[PDB]
Amino acid sequence: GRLHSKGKGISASAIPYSRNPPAWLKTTPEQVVEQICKLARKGATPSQIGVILRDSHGIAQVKVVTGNKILRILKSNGLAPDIPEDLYFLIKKAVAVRKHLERNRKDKDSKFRLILIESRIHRLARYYKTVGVLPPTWKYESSTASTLVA
Amino acid sequence: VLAVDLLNPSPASEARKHKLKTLVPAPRSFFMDVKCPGCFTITTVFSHAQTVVICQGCTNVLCQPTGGKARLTEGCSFRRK
Amino acid sequence: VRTSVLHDALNSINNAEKMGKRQVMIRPSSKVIVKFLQVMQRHGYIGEFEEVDNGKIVVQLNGRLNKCGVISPRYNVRLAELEKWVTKLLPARQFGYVILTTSAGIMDHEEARRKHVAGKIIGFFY
RNA sequence: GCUCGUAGUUGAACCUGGGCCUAGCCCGCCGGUCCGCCUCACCGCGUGCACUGGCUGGGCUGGG
RNA sequence: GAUUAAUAGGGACAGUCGGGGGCGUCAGUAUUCAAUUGUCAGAGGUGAAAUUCUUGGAUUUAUUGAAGACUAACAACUGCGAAAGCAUUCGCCAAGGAUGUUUUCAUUAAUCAGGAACGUAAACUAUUAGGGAUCGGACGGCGUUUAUUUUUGACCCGUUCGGCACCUUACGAUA
Ligand SMILES: [Zn+2]
């Protein structure tokens, strides 16, 4: 239940029924795919892609219009991030916290949150390793996290 | 209470239930069409937009984001589908 | 977390039969739950159920049953063992039924003795 | 004292092509009776909302 | 060649929310110390006293200055943080919660052996089933006040998630 901190929180995004039409929200799937490809080329994460689509174009879900999800489409056209988005954001967050610790050390709450983030990264990292995404042996410390940054 | 038709709740009790707690869950958000009176352009905006949606050019606006529904701007029209 | 969604469903059925309600909202559905309620409906302990989709199950119950239960390790059982397992699980041999996941499907112990097939004990009601 | 964490432990749902027989009807084809056609004749053709039987011809549906 | 998109996850964005944390800064009194005056006989404590300070003037009256501490009243059957804990304003720095979304990889997850980070006291003791309050979103609106009229906010009401706590009932229990 929201992992680390206590608190349930039922903040969830709903998905409607009939995974096919939203008809009056026109535009062919091919056009949507090409827009997604353009966004990927400009350098945006799948989640950011989805948000952009939500903002401007007549879309509901890519999985509805097109046969595939965004990440799956990116993988088919070989335009996917090095470290699968969420993992990349977590490592960026960990780097930021380490840099804050380096600037000022006594902040024990920041050190605790750093530890939490590292644990969450390890939790993600193990399961990514299992699903043959990331190459075996993946360190997530200041020796490699700093090199990764972006 | 004690017996009720659970496969056929009333639409009025269904409508006051939270999103994820309706019989099959579904959204309660909608899409709008928006024009701004000097332009014949029809941008289609999501109800709970997080983007400061801009029309096809003309550095204007169409809505601002909030904690809930996007506040559509000023004088604008909206049909809702 | 109880991964036994059958046990969550059967806990909800026992809570309704204690509280005297006339229907439930079994929120995580399955197929083993549907077969379980199919046997309970054959033996008349549950009126009528429907699987609606988002899915969940709405189970009209008659107010006739006493207890539902799952056997959590799911032990294997032959017929000569099945007689002793029935008379050790049920309060009486003529009251209630033991549910079996056999090679012929999911059925009660009387249908298992009819169709001459053994299997794992999955649950029971009475 | 609380949180993270490893060996360990429990680990969501979703997942039975071809041929043969059979009954009912239709559409079409074919043999005969009647009637008509044409052929000098022999003969053949049309001919089942005129009659009768056949078709392992075609189509739909049910059952094995 | 790629399922439901989970009423379990992690992330992104937006408006936010908080007496959560660090660094600086800004104040506020009060206490002590010192100075300048007006002093002019006690002052201080205690149940009574005494030690002590007191014509070089104590305590007191007024005005400044310095130092260290803390943040009254607001202050709650509340808020935030995992815990100890956290109350002056403003700035900076990251982080976190919930909500909403027309956001993504699709088992990543649950639990803790080993280990790792933060740290004078005690003394009377799957639902319950809703309702009344409460605060944080999001939505809706007959209206009062902003409002010279639109924003927007305050008040009232309803819906919806989420969370500290009350009472009733146990759905029971059981040591
Ligand atoms: Zn325009």
Write down the residue that tokens 């903002």 correspond to.
A55
The dihedral through the CA atoms of B1, B2, B4, B6 has a sign that is: positive
DSSP 8-state secondary structure symbol assigned to residue C95 = B
In Å, what resolution does this model reach? 7.1
CA distance A70 to chain B (A): 20
**Which chains, if any, share at least 3 CB pairs under 8 A with chain A?**
B
What would the DSSP string read from start to end of A28-61?
-HHHHHHHHHHHHHH---HHHHHHHHHHHSS-S-
Q: Work out the angle between the directed axes of helices A108-130 and A86-103 (0-180°, nearest 10).
A: 150
Write down the residue that tokens 């056999």 correspond to.
C102
What residues in A contact B65, CB-CB < 8 Å? Answer: none
Three-state SS for B71?
strand
Closest CA to C125 of C58, C66, C60, C57: C66
| CA separation for the pair A91, A113 (Å, rounded) | 13
Q: Which nucleotide is nearest to C72 (CA to C1')?
A: D10
Element (H or E) spanning C32, and its range?
Answer: helix C32-42
Q: Which of B2, B6, B24 sits opposite C55 (nearest CB)?
A: B24
Q: Which nucleotide is nearest to C2 (CA to C1')?
A: D10
Q: What is the 3-state secondary structure (H, E, C) of A119-145?
A: HHHHHHHHHHHHCCCCCCCCCCCHHHH
Asked if A148 and A125 touch (Cβ cutoff 8 Å), the reply is no
- The one-letter amino acid code at A18 reads S
| CA separation for the pair C100, C106 (Å, rounded) | 6
- The one-letter amino acid code at C35 reads K
Query: How would you class C44 by CB atoms within 10 Å of its CB: exposed for 0-12, middle for 13-18, buried for 19 or more?
Result: exposed
| CA separation for the pair C16, C19 (Å, rounded) | 5
Q: Do B24 and C54 touch (CB under 8 A)?
A: yes
C101 beta partners: C106, C120
Asked if C61 and C13 touch (Cβ cutoff 8 Å), the reply is yes
Assess A17–B contact: CB distance below 8 Å, yes or no. yes
- What is Dmax (Cα atoms) for chain C? 44
- H runs (alpha helix) in A77-107: 86-103
Task: Centre a 10 Å sphere on the Cβ of residue C84 and count the other Cβ atoms it contains.
Answer: 10
Tokens read off for A140? 């997530």
Asked if B51 and A51 touch (Cβ cutoff 8 Å), the reply is yes
Three-state SS for B62?
strand
Three-state SS for B40?
coil
- CA of A78 and C1' of E62: distance in angstroms? 85
Q: Do A55 and B25 touch (CB under 8 A)?
A: no
Task: Centre a 10 Å sphere on the Cβ of residue C99 and count the other Cβ atoms it contains.
Answer: 27
Q: Work out the angle between the directed axes of helices A46-56 and A29-42 (0-180°, nearest 10).
A: 130
CA B64 to mean position of chain CA atoms: 14
CA B15-B17-B18 angle, 5° bins: 115
Residue A18 region by backbone torsions, left for phi larger than 0, else alpha for psi between -120 and 50, else beta: left
Instruction: Report the structure determination method.
Output: cryo-EM
Pairing outcome for strands B71-72 and B63-64: antiparallel
Element (H or E) spanning C113, and its range?
Answer: helix C109-115
**Residues C68, C71, C74, C76: what is their CA dihedral angle, to the nearest 10 degrees?**
-90
Q: Which of B3, B4, B24 sits opposite C52 (nearest CB)?
A: B24
Residue B8 CB-half CA count within 13 A? 3
- CA of A2 and C1' of E113: distance in angstroms? 26
Residues in chain C, overall count = 126
Element (H or E) spanning C40, and its range?
Answer: helix C32-42
Q: Do B26 and A14 touch (CB under 8 A)?
A: yes
Asked if A3 and A42 touch (Cβ cutoff 8 Å), the reply is no
Residues in chain A, overall count = 150
The dihedral through the CA atoms of C35, C39, C45, C48 has a sign that is: positive
